[PDB]
Design a protein around this nucleic acid. Structure first.
Ligand SMILES: [Cl-]
Ligand SMILES: [Cl-]
Ligand SMILES: [Mg+2]
Ligand SMILES: [Mg+2]
Ligand SMILES: [Mg+2]
Ligand SMILES: [Mg+2]
Ligand SMILES: [Mg+2]
Ligand SMILES: [Mg+2]
Ligand SMILES: [Mg+2]
Ligand SMILES: [Mg+2]
Ligand SMILES: [Mg+2]
Ligand SMILES: [Mg+2]
Ligand SMILES: [Mg+2]
Ligand SMILES: [Mg+2]
Ligand SMILES: [Mg+2]
Ligand SMILES: [Mg+2]
Ligand SMILES: [Mg+2]
Ligand SMILES: [Mg+2]
Ligand SMILES: [Mg+2]
Ligand SMILES: [Mg+2]
Ligand SMILES: [Mg+2]
Ligand SMILES: [Mg+2]
Ligand code: NA
Ligand code: NA
Ligand code: NA
Ligand code: NA
Ligand code: NA
Ligand code: NA
Ligand code: NA
Ligand code: NA
Ligand code: NA
Ligand code: NA
Ligand code: NA
Ligand code: NA
Lengths: 143, 81, 56, 46, 82
RNA sequence: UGUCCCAACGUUGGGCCCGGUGAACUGUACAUUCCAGUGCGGAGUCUGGAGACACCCAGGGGGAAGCGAAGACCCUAUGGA
RNA sequence: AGGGAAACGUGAUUCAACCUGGGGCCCAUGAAAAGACGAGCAUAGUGUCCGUACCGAGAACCGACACAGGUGUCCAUGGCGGCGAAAGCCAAGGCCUGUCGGGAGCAACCAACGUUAGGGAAUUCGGCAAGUUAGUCCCGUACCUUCGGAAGAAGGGAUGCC
RNA sequence: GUCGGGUGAGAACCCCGACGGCCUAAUGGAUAAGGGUUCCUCAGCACUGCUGAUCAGCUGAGGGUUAGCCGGUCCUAAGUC
RNA sequence: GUGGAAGUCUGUUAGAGUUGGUGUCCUACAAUACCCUCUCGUGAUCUAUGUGUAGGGGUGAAAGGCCCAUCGAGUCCGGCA
RNA sequence: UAUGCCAGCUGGUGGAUUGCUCGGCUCAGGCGCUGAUGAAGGACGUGCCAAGCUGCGAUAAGCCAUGGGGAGCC
């Protein structure tokens, strides 16, 4: 018996990789006689032909690590591989910070805490990189 | 002068088209268009051609898959030849 | 790179083809001229006296 | 490659010439196809 | 029938990446000798095979307890893990 | 730091034996040779001695001025480029 | 509608494709033409001719061969990893056809290679070959210089897990 | 690769299952050129296949490629006639 | 601090190249290959397809390099015995 | 007396030799243009089964007429 033709057919009918189709060792003779796709579907319905299950990589160990790293662990000098600027894009970080500080000053303005002249002064200072962060900005604001 | 229809292309597949789709397959002169095949077919067998599909074969000949109207029956038209 | 074997690999260009006029596979499809019969270059057929011994 | 209708006709003929001398001709002639061409071992024209 | 312990120390004479194969041969050779039968007549139940190949082709276990039975009209042995 | 003193052990694939498949190089003839001599002055074959029972397996290549290429060097040609 | 044995989800983050902006550079200025838009709607008729198989490569291509060579494009967003389209490991998919096998602890010898005490270039034309060093962070850095550089100079320290 | 089993006159290498592995810009998927029927089916082993073969890209016979909306076709480019 | 310049750096990203091993091979896997090592890798860059230049002529970041395994004057046939 | 040397015998391999000639080579006489009224050449077809050659051209190893020829032919 040579069921290689059928393998090809079952894989298309079951819509699966040929390597996943399973032929019951006790029914080679019958499968051997399967000539048409329909013959195949029929043997499929009798469970003589089935499709093994595809695996997936377990993300269990990945998740635990993900937690430790999200909490601040496993990132010591001994765990870094890329240059600093590689681990965190300096320009990208500046865009983050400067936007925060510009959004902050924007709120205090509308909010009334700052006069369009104080704001202007602070905005310009921020664009000039005078505040390390929003907190630092607020601090400076309070004289 | 060359004739349009050469002869009926009768093979297992041709049968399936005839029994399940009401189509007739023919070997036709490769200079013939779908239009010509349609006409030539109706006049020879007295039927209503609905559609024609052509294919220039690796046999040097042109094959035409002619579908008849529900009004006509391929199985019967072919049974008289 | 070797001009030999390794340079044979890029040879997938079609040039000389079956000639409409003489039937030989010498119609250079890029030149549109037959190297065998001259079709595409000369109305008269390509022929030369050196295609045979001088006294024949 | 994209073949034309003509080219296709030619390849077709070539394929047909690639058949064997029918058995009956053997008997009728009281006793080879010298134009046998394999696709891999041989090369067609054009 | 009986229960036998097959030593597979001799599979180390064969290149390491191919121990499994050699071990499977030793097992058949062993039964054939100890059960006075032709190595042709020795049938190893897949269990045995899976035991030997458990850690791959290169890491076969040094021994293997095998259960075998002898009989029939041409003489033979059927064996399996234990 | 096995480049070396100075080599060792081990790993894998060969190598060796078995089944199957199955070329080429090379061949005037003869040929078990060795030491000397002699010869166109660089001899398995001449001369004198010595040695030498036949066949086969494995080896590393001393000799056949080994095999491969009508010497590129040099000179000659009322030669070539 | 379809598809699924079934359930036949909702939110989020980062976001290839795709869309749409801003800046900078040229002693370099980055096609053309058909066609489309501009220029509505109903109904009906027509839409012929050629290609379409398969391979696309450690066997379907070129290389005399089922040749370890050569041969263009797209998939560059599958998971862990990590700077990464890297390694290493693993999915999906593919494969056991880089297609002869059996046996000897399996000697000499060879090819690839691991480890060698003490010495440490004595080796050799020559350190050829092999080896040492290494990622990341902190400290620190000479001569010289066209002031750009030299520079990762050198040298010192740290590095896991919970 | 290995153990079972299937077919067969014949099975290490044709097929089924399990176990063990290989490939991760490729040994996966879709294609251009080029090839030209190599595609599928049935029947075979004198040839071809680095051994064998019940297998095959081999031998023989049949079958297979369907388009208004995917390409060509149309436009024009270096340039060509 | 921002900005992100460069025939700029590191880099087996893809791709291109070819320094040493005078390794493996050298009746090859191969009439220029295999492995490790090494160079370039935003540019005078690499690359597909199309197209132009023809033999005392092309093309040449120049080696007398290259013009289909053919180059200090291609190849084919003829002069030609 | 293994491995083996020389000659022969039987069988083989091989295809010389002899014989044969549907082919060549050369001389000699006769004759001599074809084509847009589409030649020569080529391509693809054409047979019951048809791969090659020959013939032929969708009227496709052929159709018609006249003469010859003759009981066979495809
Ligand atoms: Cl912007
Ligand atoms: Cl297409
Ligand atoms: Mg910056
Ligand atoms: Mg079509
Ligand atoms: Mg050359
Ligand atoms: Mg066929
Ligand atoms: Mg000489
Ligand atoms: Mg000289
Ligand atoms: Mg001169
Ligand atoms: Mg397709
Ligand atoms: Mg192969
Ligand atoms: Mg030491
Ligand atoms: Mg010294
Ligand atoms: Mg010395
Ligand atoms: Mg070195
Ligand atoms: Mg097939
Ligand atoms: Mg079969
Ligand atoms: Mg650079
Ligand atoms: Mg680089
Ligand atoms: Mg070009
Ligand atoms: Mg010079
Ligand atoms: Mg040539
Ligand atoms: Na037909
Ligand atoms: Na071919
Ligand atoms: Na060593
Ligand atoms: Na020697
Ligand atoms: Na990733
Ligand atoms: Na094999
Ligand atoms: Na600045
Ligand atoms: Na190299
Ligand atoms: Na010249
Ligand atoms: Na000459
Ligand atoms: Na005449
Ligand atoms: Na014929």
């Amino acid at each position: 018996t040579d069921l290689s033709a059928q393998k090809r057919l079952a894989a298309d009918v079951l819509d699966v990789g040929k390597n996943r189709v399973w032929f019951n060792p006790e029914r080679q003779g019958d499968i051997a006689d399967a000539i048409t796709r329909e013959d195949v579907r029929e043997l499929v319905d009798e469970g003589a032909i089935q499709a093994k299950d595809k695996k997936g990589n377990s993300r269990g160990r990945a998740r635990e690590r993900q937690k430790k790293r999200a909490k601040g662990h496993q990132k010591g000098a001994g765990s870094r591989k890329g240059k600093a600027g590689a681990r965190q894009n300096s320009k990208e970080d500046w865009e983050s910070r400067i936007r925060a500080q510009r959004t902050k000053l924007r709120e205090l303005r509308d909010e009334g805490t700052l006069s369009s002249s104080q704001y202007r002064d602070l905005y310009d200072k921020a664009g000039g990189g005078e505040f390390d962060s929003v907190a630092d900005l607020e601090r400076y604001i309070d004289a | 002068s060359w004739d349009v229809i050469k002869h009926p292309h009768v093979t297992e597949k041709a049968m399936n088209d005839m029994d399940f789709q009401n189509k007739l397959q023919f070997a036709v002169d490769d200079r013939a268009s779908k239009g010509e095949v349609a006409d030539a077919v109706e006049e020879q067998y007295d039927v209503t051609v609905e559609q024609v599909n052509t294919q220039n074969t690796m046999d040097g000949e042109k094959k035409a898959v002619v579908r008849l109207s529900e009004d006509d029956d391929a199985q019967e038209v072919a049974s008289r030849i | 790179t070797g001009a030999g074997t390794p340079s044979q690999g890029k040879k997938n260009t079609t040039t000389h083809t079956k000639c409409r006029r003489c039937g030989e596979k010498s119609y250079h499809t890029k030149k549109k001229v037959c190297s065998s019969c001259g079709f595409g270059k000369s109305a008269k057929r390509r022929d030369y006296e050196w295609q045979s011994k001088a006294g024949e | 490659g994209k073949k034309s209708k003509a080219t296709k006709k030619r390849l077709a003929k070539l394929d047909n010439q690639n058949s064997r001398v029918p058995a009956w001709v053997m008997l009728k002639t009281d006793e080879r196809n010298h134009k046998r061409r394999h696709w891999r071992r041989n090369d067609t024209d054009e | 029938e009986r229960v036998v312990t097959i030593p597979l120390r001799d599979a180390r004479a064969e290149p390491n990446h191919k121990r499994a194969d050699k071990a499977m041969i030793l097992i058949r050779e062993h039964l054939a000798k100890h059960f006075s039968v032709d190595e042709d007549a020795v049938r190893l139940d897949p269990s045995i095979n899976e035991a030997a190949w458990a850690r791959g082709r290169a890491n076969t276990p040094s021994k293997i307890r095998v259960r075998a039975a002898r009989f029939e009209e041409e003489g033979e042995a059927i064996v399996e893990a234990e």
